Amino acid sequence: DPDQFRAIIESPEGAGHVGYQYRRNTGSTMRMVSDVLDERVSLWDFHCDPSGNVIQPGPNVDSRQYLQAAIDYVSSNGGGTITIPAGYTWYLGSYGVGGIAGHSGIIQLRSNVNLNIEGRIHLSPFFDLKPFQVFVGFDNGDPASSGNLENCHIYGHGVVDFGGYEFGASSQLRNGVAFGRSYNCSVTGITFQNGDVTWAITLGWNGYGSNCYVRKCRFINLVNSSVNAAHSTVYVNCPYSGVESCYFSMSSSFARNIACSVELHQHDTFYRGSTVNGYCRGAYVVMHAAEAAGAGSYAYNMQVENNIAVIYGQFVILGSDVTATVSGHLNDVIVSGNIVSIGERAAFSAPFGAFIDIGPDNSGASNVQDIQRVLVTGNSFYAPANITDSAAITLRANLNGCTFIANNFDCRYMVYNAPGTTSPVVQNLVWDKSNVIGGTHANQRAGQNLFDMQFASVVNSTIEVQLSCEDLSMFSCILFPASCQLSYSKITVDSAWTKSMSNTAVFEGNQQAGANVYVSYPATVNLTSYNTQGAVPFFSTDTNYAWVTSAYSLSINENLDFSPPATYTNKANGQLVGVGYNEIGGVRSVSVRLMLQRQV
Amino acid sequence: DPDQFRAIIESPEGAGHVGYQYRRNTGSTMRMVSDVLDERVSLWDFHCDPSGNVIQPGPNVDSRQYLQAAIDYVSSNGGGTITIPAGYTWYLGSYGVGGIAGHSGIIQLRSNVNLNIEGRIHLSPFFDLKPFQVFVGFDNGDPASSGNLENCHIYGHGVVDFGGYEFGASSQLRNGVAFGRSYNCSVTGITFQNGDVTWAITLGWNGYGSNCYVRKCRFINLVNSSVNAAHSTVYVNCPYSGVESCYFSMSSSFARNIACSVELHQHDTFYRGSTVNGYCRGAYVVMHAAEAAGAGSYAYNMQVENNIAVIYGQFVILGSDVTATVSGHLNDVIVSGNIVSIGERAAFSAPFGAFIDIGPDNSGASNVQDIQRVLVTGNSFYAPANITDSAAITLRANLNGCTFIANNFDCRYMVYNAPGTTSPVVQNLVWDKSNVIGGTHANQRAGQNLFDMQFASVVNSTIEVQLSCEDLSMFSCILFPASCQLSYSKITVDSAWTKSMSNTAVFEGNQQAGANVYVSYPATVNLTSYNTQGAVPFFSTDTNYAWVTSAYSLSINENLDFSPPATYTNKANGQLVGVGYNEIGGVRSVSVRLMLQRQV
Amino acid sequence: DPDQFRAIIESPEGAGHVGYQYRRNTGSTMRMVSDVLDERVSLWDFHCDPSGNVIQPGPNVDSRQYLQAAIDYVSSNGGGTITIPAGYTWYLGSYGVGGIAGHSGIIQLRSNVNLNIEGRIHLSPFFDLKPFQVFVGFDNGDPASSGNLENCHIYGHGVVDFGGYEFGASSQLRNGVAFGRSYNCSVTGITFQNGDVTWAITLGWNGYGSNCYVRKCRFINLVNSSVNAAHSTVYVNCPYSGVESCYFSMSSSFARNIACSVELHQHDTFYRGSTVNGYCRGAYVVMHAAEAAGAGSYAYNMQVENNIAVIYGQFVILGSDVTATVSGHLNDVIVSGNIVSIGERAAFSAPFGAFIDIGPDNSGASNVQDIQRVLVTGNSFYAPANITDSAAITLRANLNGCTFIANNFDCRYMVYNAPGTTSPVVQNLVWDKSNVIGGTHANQRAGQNLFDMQFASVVNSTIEVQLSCEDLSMFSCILFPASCQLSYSKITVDSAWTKSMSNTAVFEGNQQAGANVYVSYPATVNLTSYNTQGAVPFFSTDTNYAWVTSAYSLSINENLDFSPPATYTNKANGQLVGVGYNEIGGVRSVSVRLMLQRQV
Ligand SMILES: CC(=O)N[C@@H]1[C@@H](O[C@H]2O[C@H](CO)[C@H](O[C@H]3O[C@H](CO[C@@H]4O[C@@H](C)[C@H](O)[C@@H](O)[C@H]4O)[C@@H](O)[C@H](O)[C@H]3O)[C@H](O[C@@H]3O[C@H](CO)[C@@H](O)[C@H](O)[C@H]3NC(C)=O)[C@H]2O)[C@H](O)[C@@H](CO)O[C@H]1O
Ligand SMILES: CC(=O)N[C@@H]1[C@@H](O[C@H]2O[C@H](CO)[C@H](O[C@H]3O[C@H](CO[C@@H]4O[C@@H](C)[C@H](O)[C@@H](O)[C@H]4O)[C@@H](O)[C@H](O)[C@H]3O)[C@H](O[C@@H]3O[C@H](CO)[C@@H](O)[C@H](O)[C@H]3NC(C)=O)[C@H]2O)[C@H](O)[C@@H](CO)O[C@H]1O
Ligand SMILES: CC(=O)N[C@@H]1[C@@H](O[C@H]2O[C@H](CO)[C@H](O[C@H]3O[C@H](CO[C@@H]4O[C@@H](C)[C@H](O)[C@@H](O)[C@H]4O)[C@@H](O)[C@H](O)[C@H]3O)[C@H](O[C@@H]3O[C@H](CO)[C@@H](O)[C@H](O)[C@H]3NC(C)=O)[C@H]2O)[C@H](O)[C@@H](CO)O[C@H]1O
Ligand code: NA
Ligand code: NA
Ligand code: NA
Ligand code: NA
Ligand code: NA
Ligand code: NA
């Protein structure tokens, strides 16, 4: 048998016959070399032909079956981490089988089986013009019948490369990682690049899942064709999950019209600390009734914070909707610390530029939403001067509340909705005086209202307009068409930089006269006094001030021989009246800039 | 000796006789296989019986001595990283010995010895009803006599499972990781679950330590019994240390009354980017005089940012206290970007709901604190409408300053302390007008004051109340009992949504008359004029306005034949007086809503 | 040949003859032991003499050539990760050769070759008093002729120790990691310590590079001598790059005058979540025209967020400058969530304390900058009471815009520039009323203006001063010297805590009279009435009020027999005039505190 010894050694069992003890420590386990090598595993351990000879990866080799055999085997031992070695590109060239075939799946992920991707995974041209989802954690073609994927992490310095292939048809779907009904799963460090896909990563399934995250990943050039119907790089569809410290970049013209970086679709989800360039949209924050199975009908505790973006459309898009039996609700959202610009483009050349959009549902309905208790604070937004279609908020569907405090918005509109489109019902819209309104679009606003209140109704709302520079081009600071009801609201226009404006606040239906409307704004008023020497009344010539509770002078008095009143009340006939002083008698006639006040 | 060759090879020294050169590179080191295997180490290298045969882990095997032998040996070589292999559960079934026995220690950590926990560490039922601290970095039973633990990191995808065992007695202590006097130590990635413990992780010891962190960890179901006296998942007791991007969840009813996610107890500490569900409390931020040995008597540079929480009690609890010889101080705190809700519960069913609590000391003393220079900004807080016991701040102990700017608070009270309890001394409480006060509790506030100023005294404080909707249920917006002194303060109530309120600001001791009190609020006032045609005075019927410096009309004038004054001063007898206008003579009698102003 | 078998086995090819199959899986690859060992690589694989015998590291061994041979070889295979083993200190004792010699380079980094530093890398005394850059990613002495460094990550629990050696001459440069023209490079986890260097890490080169990051690193004691000209621990000189969750500490007195933690020099860069102690400065945010080659002439999307600092000079320093052919621009910056203190020091003992500094260029020019669209929000700043030289903003060079909202600034000055120095041109400076002004420096401000507007001109600016306590020591709240033009601006001083101030707002050139200046502030005014019983005019004795549009009483009326007017206008001769009431006749003389208003 010393023949058998040499033979044993050269055989696949040879390492199992060579002894080892850690650092020659006599207190350590007496092991065999194979035991120590068995502590780790790589694709090389499965990337072999039927006789066991290793196969080199490359563009003419389909690595799929080998990677799947590796995952299957490690799963059978309770899990571990498979390395995809550095220094090689591992091509995938066929579809998987079984439960992932209903998802156009390539590789099936398994619980407790982690992938350390150090090398590159590329798609072969077998996938050109076809659907695919590269890594799939469902174990059934019907997600409702799927088991869970748990404790599965994909990480490393490596790369998933989608081969540059365009979509074959708009109806197709393409994904990088679908974790499925996914609990404690994550992707960290990986670069996803060079594709035309629907998503790079999806987390959860209709609210099933928990604790799934995307961290320190890069997503580069993942839309490239006019065939691609839509793209959102990460879709978060389970609670207690999020995206942090990622980098998203697109260069395609199509991406400026179709691509969104993240979608948050379940409660207790976040998007923070990320950088986006070249995209249409930053994030959807939406509660879809259709997605309410696993974690309820409410999206709450939604956080979009500390991101950096250059986009062409809207930064954050809010939504909720209904099905026949389920109603979706969105509340308790915070959008904070973000610095966002609309990139250089012509006006109207991409979807309407906005920091916040209150969007209709997927079928265009604007009367299904239940969105409230949103806080938008400490963000910056800029849009170049030429971009007419830029707003701090485009309010296009019913809104039950949104609060803006201490932002800096430098764009064409503050509040906007297109007239003759939707007529949203608006409650609890709060625009605090601490919102700074920039000057980039000064002189560009002919015909336009800075706050264009194109709504069915506004209730329990606050708009405290404060300019920081002049813009005499604008038609008004805030305008309410006669079709918009206004009640139980506070609307103020600070006088600074308004002395030369002919219109400040405009109420085309006289809505400022409502019983519970609290307003103030500047106006110019012509007055005429009685003749009397001494204390003498001045009265407005016009009679449109029956709503005014007090007014006071914003003008100097160039006269020596008299002074108009400093302050005014009204009279039943709608004149203002106040008591001035004639040092010498005579009828006086003056035109004065006043702060008109109602109940404030 | 070719017999000895075969024998050498099969022996524990065999790998030390098989040559190796990296990738057949002739410029590489001529090594032996054992040298390459010696670059890594796992528990398997020590998990062996006295004859060196490997032992399989499992519920009837106590892995403690093997893990300790591994740590001891790697420490002896200057450190390294021990893997706790994936695919196995490693049970701990006895107490450690030596310096950790005074801490109910199981495993002793050692400097530069890292644990990569990929598999699961479970506690055996030996620990049921007993104290324990699983990993302990002290090397002495008396922490004052302990050496340091340095450069010790615990990380991986694995799990520490506390076996579900309840506490045996309230007085017992249980911990996962006590790093001790810990410098550059960390826990990353690990799931701590299934226990009834006091803490999961503690960092530092009485201010000794530095640069210790908890990142991307999960803490799940760590309270389960009514025996557990108290739980705080991470206790940070060294400077330059913190918690980031963690997940905390509890399901026990007891956790809603006793559990806190983090405690920050030393300067330059942080809690950010984390998600909490099912807990009583978010974070304590406290300078205990008793803990002031290693880093001084001041907790400064304390940061609670960008967290997401559903809790049942208080979000942030501030404190400082004294011993006979040391006085603790808390200053330079920021609480920012947090989104927090009180979970669904009955009123008074858990500790009083609050965003910020200024808590007494551990013995209930409210006159020992030195808390100042705190900034609370850009946070959201919500509590359901039924939860009477919910406040933006419960101010229950002396306060030397706290600043609120640009938050959104939607709960029952803004400022609250219970009457007939403590009478805190309050300085430098600043509530900026940019705090938005939500409407969820509108109509729920019968008998209640929105700002209930139940203090001994208030000085150098600012309360700028701004409503955003009506709540005519409330007794007042702000009330000062006669027992609260008020001086050198600014108190304003914006008129919006207040026209129908009978009380806006209430000063039960006439404190608004103080020399350095600056106030304004709406009131209804009855006036009567003299008969005279022309400019004519109107005087208040009541005489309680000797403190008023000016007042102006918040009401329209329904009359044609006269107008009351737009603006009023006072007279020595406490009447208001202003000059209106009688177009026709006659004594006039009117009831007007005024903005009463003092020194503003 | 069984002689040759034993011989084969003991030779460097021996492991290539011992068979292995993973976990005895018959479906796995039939490999050799050497194949499995070849999956990893360490310095030990190259740290050998010319005959291949391993060399032990230590202070008398220069490890440089071995580490370079390792990097060179792994590069030749397409990359991988080289471990620098734990438990050893690896000394570097000579300069590298080739392309890195022009950079005083020691080690040349190569693309796709990662370093896992678990042990310690120390500099030997060969480097004492000499320049050095430890790791260099340029491949040419001229960076303009360099190739790129891509996909190179340095990470681990290890340490780079600079040996404590002082600089030999101020003109020398020292660096830890210069990634060069660096794309997807990073440093994670590493401690840099014990040095006198210029930088620890630099990212990019003149805008060439992308996606480079520094995360969870520590930088400890990296300045130690008066020879060191300047230090900035991380210099970010490529876009889409940043620093997060790092720790920076200095103990040297020299560091308080010279050291800065980070510099952001290209667009889409960030500095977040970090802690700094012992430094002069927090971060420069600068667009240098000289550095504009690779990513354009604009620094935009610059983020400084959520940091904790104790510094001695300025927190954030803004800049832009020009060369003959290129003009640098800085815009779209956010500074948010930071908590910053000037450490204990004497007044004037370190560079002028500031939260924000608008600094000149490197040659002192203050008329080259183009800095605008900056948002500073939700930060705290404190400086001890004695530190005269402390300001929220030192505005020392031309400024095209900066917006402050909802900060808490507790220091000597709000806005400051030294008189008789630079006279900056100021546009779009916005100080919102929601900035809280602390009280630490109350009583310290004799001779001083809280807002000291020492500028050539101010346009399109807003200063809304709101005190929160009294400081009657100060000369004024805001002062404009006659040399500062003021136009199209809003300047307000809230009356709270101002009743006893003799000066509130001071316009030494009467600038508040400008046509488009909107102001309000308190003043004391002496008035005298006519004799007449009844409605009767009161007129100011002084004639300096021709600019006043309205005024109203901030004083009570102690009289029964008359009342002064509640509100006043002006007259052409610059008197105020209003209508009061004489119940009994007689000339009245009163001194009243008024809110003077112009166009507000
Ligand atoms: C691209 C994108 O994210 N758009 C956002 C809107 O999403 C809706 O439209 C997209 C268009 O791609 C998705 O619908 C497509 O896909 C669904 C789901 O695919 C099936 O189920 C998978 C689990 C399985 O792997 C697949 O093989 C398919 O069987 C398909 O049913 C639709 O017909 C198809 O148009 C998106 O669906 C969700 O996708 C996420 C992520 O994969 C899943 O977790 C959810 O279960 C899907 N939800 C539903 C209700 O089916 C649609 O929700 C989005 O509504 C709006 C507003 O936020 O923004 C767009 O940007
Ligand atoms: C649970 C919690 O964190 N509660 C917070 C309050 O903490 C105080 O009460 C808790 C109750 O558990 C702790 O006191 C218990 O433990 C201490 C410390 O244990 C000893 O020293 C350890 C180093 C050693 O391992 C152990 O074997 C024990 O010898 C004990 O002395 C008390 O009798 C006991 O009730 C907590 O003590 C601190 O614990 C941290 C973390 O372990 C240590 O770093 C500190 O050294 C301990 N501090 C002191 C002064 O001993 C008490 O501080 C807390 O005060 C309030 C306010 O923030 O909030 C509660 O939530
Ligand atoms: C210390 C610091 O960061 N100070 C900040 C100012 O930086 C300027 O001054 C410093 C002083 O050290 C640097 O100038 C020194 O270095 C440059 C660059 O070195 C050469 O090129 C390297 C690529 C190469 O490795 C070296 O061998 C040298 O050949 C040198 O040209 C100067 O003579 C010398 O004084 C700094 O230069 C930049 O350094 C970064 C980081 O290394 C490089 O990426 C840039 O390419 C250099 N930029 C230029 C224009 O050469 C100077 O920019 C800084 O201006 C101000 C304001 O932000 O703040 C100081 O804190
Ligand atoms: Na499908
Ligand atoms: Na309508
Ligand atoms: Na003890
Ligand atoms: Na009292
Ligand atoms: Na050089
Ligand atoms: Na000038």
The DSSP secondary structure of B112-175, one letter per residue, reads TEEEEE-SEEEE-GGGTTS-EEEEE--SSSSGGG---EEEEEEESS-EEE-TTPPPSSTT--EE
Q: Which helix (H) or strand (E) holds B72?
A: helix B64-76
Q: Give the residue whose CA is nearest to atom 27 of ligand 1.
A: A103
At a CB cut-off of 8 Å and minimum separation 6, what does A310 contact?
A276, A277, A278, A340, A341, A342, A343, C268, C301
C102 is known to lie in a ligand binding site: yes
For residue A58, CA distances in Å to A44, A118, A195, B278 come to 13, 16, 19, 51
| A552 contact residues in C (CB cutoff 8 A) | 550, 567
Residue identified by tokens 């020299």 is C254
Q: Give the residue whose CA is nearest to atom 20 of ligand 1.
A: A103
Closest ligand relative to A209 C-alpha: 1
For residue A5, CA distances in Å to A2, A10, B19, C5 come to 5, 9, 18, 11
Which two tokens mark A483?
A: 């079709």
What 8-state DSSP symbol labels residue B592? Answer: E
The DSSP secondary structure of C31-69, one letter per residue, reads EEHHHHHTT-EEGGGT-B-TTS-B---STT---HHHHHH
Q: Which helix (H) or strand (E) holds C35?
A: helix C33-37
Ligand 2 pocket, B260 CB below 6 A?
Answer: yes
Q: Residues of C numbered 59-88 whose beta carbons fall under 8 angstroms of chain B's beta carbons: which are they?
A: 69, 73, 77, 83, 85-88
Ligand 2 pocket, B145 CB below 6 A?
Answer: no
Q: At how many degrees (to 10) do helices B2-10 and C2-10 cross? A: 40
Which two tokens mark B225?
A: 């019994």
Ligand 3 mean position, distance from CA C174 (Å): 11
- Our CA angle for B440, B445, B449, nearest 5°, is 115
List the subunits that have 3+ CB pairs under 8 angstroms with B. A, C
Closest C-alpha among B548, B541, B539 to residue B579: B539
Q: Residues of A numbered 127-166 whose beta carbons fall under 8 angstroms of chain C's beta carbons: which are they?
A: 157
Binary contact (B41, A22; C-beta < 8 A): yes
Which two tokens mark C424?
A: 């900056």
**How far, in whole angstroms, is CA C498 from its chain's centroid?**
34
Closest C-alpha among C265, C264, C263, C260 to residue C276: C260
Closest C-alpha among B563, B423, B549, B406 to residue B484: B423
At a CB cut-off of 8 Å and minimum separation 6, what does B183 contact?
B148, B149, B150, B151, B209, B210, B211, B212
Strand partners, B83: B42, B116
Q: Which helix (H) or strand (E) holds B329?
A: strand B329-336
Which two tokens mark B260?
A: 């806190």
Which two tokens mark A77?
A: 């031992």
**CA dihedral angle for residue B426, residue B428, residue B434, residue B437, rounded to 10 degrees:** -10
Binary contact (B380, A334; C-beta < 8 A): yes
Strand partners, C474: C446
Torsions phi, psi for C321 (to 5 deg): -155, 180
Closest C-alpha among A120, A114, A33 to residue C37: A33
- Cα–Cα distance, B332 to C408 (Å, whole number): 11
**Contact B488/B459 with Cβ under 8 angstroms?**
yes
At a CB cut-off of 8 Å and minimum separation 6, what does B1 contact?
none
**Contact C537/C571 with Cβ under 8 angstroms?**
no
Closest ligand relative to B132 C-alpha: 2
- Cα–Cα distance, A210 to B274 (Å, whole number): 14
Residue identified by tokens 């990097």 is C71
**Contact C162/C198 with Cβ under 8 angstroms?**
no
Ligand 3 mean position, distance from CA C151 (Å): 24
**Strands ordered across the beta sheet of C457-459:** C425-427, C457-459, C485-487
Burial class (CB in 10 A: 0-12, 13-18, 19+), A583: middle
- Cβ count within 10 A of residue C385: 15
Binary contact (A77, B87; C-beta < 8 A): yes
| C51 contact residues in B (CB cutoff 8 A) | 30
For residue C157, CA distances in Å to A179, B249, C115, C119, C160 come to 31, 30, 11, 8, 10
Amino acid at C53: N
> Strand, helix or coil at A65?
helix
Torsions phi, psi for B434 (to 5 deg): -75, 0
- Cα–Cα distance, A88 to A81 (Å, whole number): 18
**Contact C230/C198 with Cβ under 8 angstroms?**
yes
Q: Which of A257, A261, A263, A281 to mutate to test ligand 1, by most ligand atoms within 8 A of the CB atom? A: A263
Binary contact (B38, A28; C-beta < 8 A): no
- Cα–Cα distance, A156 to A86 (Å, whole number): 10
Amino acid at A272: R
Q: Is the CB of residue A306 less than 8 Å away from at least one CB of chain B?
A: yes
- Cα–Cα distance, C38 to C42 (Å, whole number): 10
**Contact B80/C157 with Cβ under 8 angstroms?**
no
Which two tokens mark A135?
A: 């890594």
Ligand 1 pocket, A455 CB below 6 A?
Answer: no
Burial class (CB in 10 A: 0-12, 13-18, 19+), B214: buried
Strand C517-529 versus strand C534-540 pairing type: antiparallel
- Cα–Cα distance, B83 to B85 (Å, whole number): 6
Q: At how many degrees (to 10) do helices B2-10 and A2-10 cross? A: 40
Experimental method for this entry?
X-ray
- Cα–Cα distance, A488 to B211 (Å, whole number): 53
Ligand 2 pocket, B471 CB below 6 A?
Answer: no
For residue A546, CA distances in Å to A566, A575, B390 come to 19, 7, 42
Strand partners, C594: C523, C553
Ligand 2 mean position, distance from CA B198 (Å): 9
- Cα–Cα distance, B491 to B360 (Å, whole number): 26
- Cα–Cα distance, A246 to A261 (Å, whole number): 10
For residue B55, CA distances in Å to A31, B60, C101, C559 come to 11, 11, 55, 99
- Cα–Cα distance, C145 to C133 (Å, whole number): 19
**Contact C440/C414 with Cβ under 8 angstroms?**
no
Residue identified by tokens 């008597």 is B297
Q: Which of B22, B532, B567 minimises the CB distance to C41? A: B22
**Contact C467/C476 with Cβ under 8 angstroms?**
no
**Contact C539/C573 with Cβ under 8 angstroms?**
no
Q: Is the CB of residue C585 less than 8 Å away from at least one CB of chain A?
A: no
Which residue intervals of B156-259 are DSSP H helices?
255-258
- Cα–Cα distance, A135 to B483 (Å, whole number): 69
- Cα–Cα distance, C48 to C56 (Å, whole number): 9
At a CB cut-off of 8 Å and minimum separation 6, what does C76 contact?
none
Binary contact (A434, B339; C-beta < 8 A): no
> Strand, helix or coil at A15?
helix
**HSE, side-chain direction, 13 A CA sphere, residue C393:** 27
Ligand 9 mean position, distance from CA C458 (Å): 9
Mutate which of A10, A380, A532 to test chain C, going by most C C-beta atoms within 10 A?
Answer: A380
- Our CA angle for A293, A299, A301, nearest 5°, is 135
CA distance B292 to chain C (A): 19
Q: Is the CB of residue C534 less than 8 Å away from at least one CB of chain B?
A: yes
Q: Give the residue whose CA is nearest to atom 20 of ligand 3.
A: C103
**Contact A243/A273 with Cβ under 8 angstroms?**
no
Q: Which residues of C480-502 are buried (b: 16+ CB within 10 A; e: fewer)?
A: bbeebbbebbbbbbbbbbbbebe
At a CB cut-off of 8 Å and minimum separation 6, what does B450 contact?
B413, B414, B437, B465, B471, B474, B476, B477, B478
Q: Residues of A numbered 411-470 whose beta carbons fall under 8 angstroms of chain B's beta carbons: which are they?
A: 428, 430, 432-434, 460, 462
- Cβ count within 10 A of residue C151: 22
- Of all atoms in ligand 3, which is nearest to the CA of residue C231? 1
Q: Residues of B numbered 260-289 whose beta carbons fall under 8 angstroms of chain C's beta carbons: which are they?
A: 268, 270, 272
Closest C-alpha among B337, B332, B422 to residue B371: B332
What domains, with CATH codes, occur in chain C? 1-81 (6.10.20.90), 82-514 (2.160.20.10), 515-600 (2.40.30.250)
Q: Which of C263, C287, C311, C326 to mutate to test ligand 3, by most ligand atoms within 8 A of the CB atom? A: C263
Instruction: Tell me the residues surrounding ligand 4 (ion) with CB < 5 Å.
Output: A 102-103
- Cα–Cα distance, A169 to A187 (Å, whole number): 28
The DSSP secondary structure of B537-598, one letter per residue, reads EEEESS---TT-SEEEE-S----SSEE--SEEEE-TTS-EEEEEEESS----EEEEEEEEEE
Q: Is the CB of residue B304 less than 8 Å away from at least one CB of chain C?
A: no
Which two tokens mark B323?
A: 């011993």
CA distance C465 to chain A (A): 14
Which residue intervals of C454-552 are DSSP H helices?
none
Maximum alpha-carbon separation in chain C: 136
At a CB cut-off of 8 Å and minimum separation 6, what does A393 contact?
A354, A355, A356, A357, A358, A402, A404, A414, A415, A416
Q: What is the CA radius of gyration of chain A?
A: 33
- Cβ count within 10 A of residue C164: 15
> Strand, helix or coil at B14?
helix
**Contact C576/C519 with Cβ under 8 angstroms?**
no
**Contact A492/A461 with Cβ under 8 angstroms?**
no
Torsions phi, psi for A45 (to 5 deg): -75, -10
For this entry, resolution in Å reads 1.5
Q: Which of A53, A69, A581 minimises the CB distance to C30? A: A53
Binary contact (A33, B37; C-beta < 8 A): yes
At a CB cut-off of 8 Å and minimum separation 6, what does B253 contact?
none
Closest C-alpha among B527, B556, C535, B582 to residue A575: B556
Ligand 4 mean position, distance from CA A150 (Å): 21
**Contact C170/C202 with Cβ under 8 angstroms?**
no
| B247 contact residues in A (CB cutoff 8 A) | 211, 240
What 8-state DSSP symbol labels residue C160? Answer: E
Amino acid at A179: F
- Cα–Cα distance, A435 to A414 (Å, whole number): 10
